[PDB]
Amino acid sequence: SMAFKIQLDTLGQLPGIYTQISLLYPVSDSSQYPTIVSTFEQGLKRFSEAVPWVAGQVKAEGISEGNTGTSFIVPFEDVPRVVVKDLRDDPSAPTIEGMRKAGYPMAMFDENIIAPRKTLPIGPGTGPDDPKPVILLQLNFIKGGLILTVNGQHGAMDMVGQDAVIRLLSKACRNDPFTEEEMTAMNLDRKTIVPYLENYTIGPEVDHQIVKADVAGGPVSASWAFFTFSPKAMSELKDAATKTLFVSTDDALSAFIWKSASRVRLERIDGSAPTEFCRAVDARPAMGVSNNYPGLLQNMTYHNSTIGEIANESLGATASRLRSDPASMRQRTRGLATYLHNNPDKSNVSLTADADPSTSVMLSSWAKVGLWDYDFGLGLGKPETVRRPIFEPVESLMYFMPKKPDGEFCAALSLRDEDMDRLKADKEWTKYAQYVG
């Protein structure tokens, strides 16, 4: 019977995480839950029947002397596992009115309560001896609602690929047809999807991506929070960035956050302190790969300055730095992939190798993913919110949520307490950013 051994993307071969994401739906009557679950399970069965590997697990082998191993997607169970957790009567769990009143804070999406597995390899069931399923799902019944949480194994998928998988799952559940293009994209070979450079040694393409003990990157009192930017805030931020330079929405918001973080950081470090902005970029367009490719095809761009310069320059000035193709993206990602491919030990490569947590910003925007459209044939409507679960603070790590269809953005920011406290009290920050927590 059906079997598979799909080598991870070379970019996914960093001995590294589950990416979690949660979708909240209102549920009018508890009479609905049995059909919610069975609709969901039928869709998962259909999807697994269509694309067997989504039900597999990631397994490393080839681990030897100075070889950090190679991971493959290999069989695990018949369908991907859904956990059904009933939290309607759990006094420590969120409720739909609590969510609504608090504006859907990250703290109400506690990974230990609403996720099937932690983000980080921490605690029980995160050993090497433990299976690493490609995908894990959880349906959380809450008072008046449903939280669906999807965990994706990060070596197997970046968020663009995860979005692609979730999207196909939703189609599956809602009896949509699959296109041939989707089935093709879902079955592209991964180990060759980035053409390698011939006779590569080491070049500017892997700047900022090789770990060195004497350079910080790759702990102290900190927290996570969401901040909301209303459609009005966003429109005005774009206006502010244009007046002082075109840049993209993403661009403007990223510059704003770098500046504000730098500004508050002036209070505890000197303006001469270097600062690096690290920005995730989907490499599929530059590679000529489908949006429906489910793997890990992503890089970062790196923008270097000082705390004082970023804080004090204009918004347009900072946004121009972030301006910051395809040629550069293709060349850099090929060099990165080739560098990894030429090295049996991949343990010294990181997309944030030199990003000092004290002064860096490490941003991954999920603003373009399509999660706000997925109903999974549940009869509940579209997600009332789309939020990343809270986990351990990771200083200077940041995400933009998928843009809400009314234009509201949400930034998930993790900062040391000193910085977080000052940001929340900062006049220029709070002009645009509403603390949610």
Three state DSSP letters for 99-112: HHHCCCCHHHCEHH
The CA distance from 18 to 160, in Å, is 14
Query: At what resolution in Å was this solved?
Result: 2.0
Residues 23 and 99: beta-carbon distance below 8 Å: no
Q: Where are the domains of the chain?
A: 1-188+368-392, 203-367+393-437
Closest Cα partner for 362 from 313, 389, 324, 398?
A: 398
Instruction: Report CA-CA distances (Å) from 325 to 287, 303, 401.
Output: 12, 15, 24
Closest Cα partner for 116 from 72, 148, 94, 146?
A: 148
Question: What backbone phi and psi angles, to 5 degrees, belong to 54?
Answer: -65, -20
Residues 342 and 13: beta-carbon distance below 8 Å: no
What 8-state DSSP symbol labels residue 390? B
Provide the token pair at 91: 């006094």
Question: What backbone phi and psi angles, to 5 degrees, belong to 242?
Answer: -75, -40
* Residue that has been written with the tokens 């041939």 in this structure: 180
Query: Would the CATH topology of 1-188+368-392 be identical to that of 203-367+393-437?
Result: yes
Domain 1-188+368-392 part of CATH 3.60.21.10: no
Which helix (DSSP H) or strand (DSSP E) does residue 386 occupy? strand 385-387
What 8-state DSSP symbol labels residue 253? H
Which amino acid, 313? E
The CA distance from 269 to 273, in Å, is 7
What 8-state DSSP symbol labels residue 133? B
Method: X-ray
Provide the token pair at 326: 């395809």
Write the class of the CATH domain 203-367+393-437: alpha beta
Render 48-90 in DSSP notation, one character per residue: HHHSGGGG-EEEEEEEETTEEEEEEEE---SS--EEEEE-TT-
Q: Is the dihedral of CA 319, 373, 150, 57 positive or negative?
A: negative
Neighbours of 49 (CB within 10 A): 13
Look at residue 416 and give its three-state secondary structure.
strand
Q: Please, is 326 exposed, middle or buried when counting C-beta atoms within 10 Å of its C-beta (0-12, 13-18, 19+)?
A: exposed
Q: CA geometry: angle at 204 spanning 199 and 209, to 5°?
A: 100
Residues 380 and 27: beta-carbon distance below 8 Å: yes
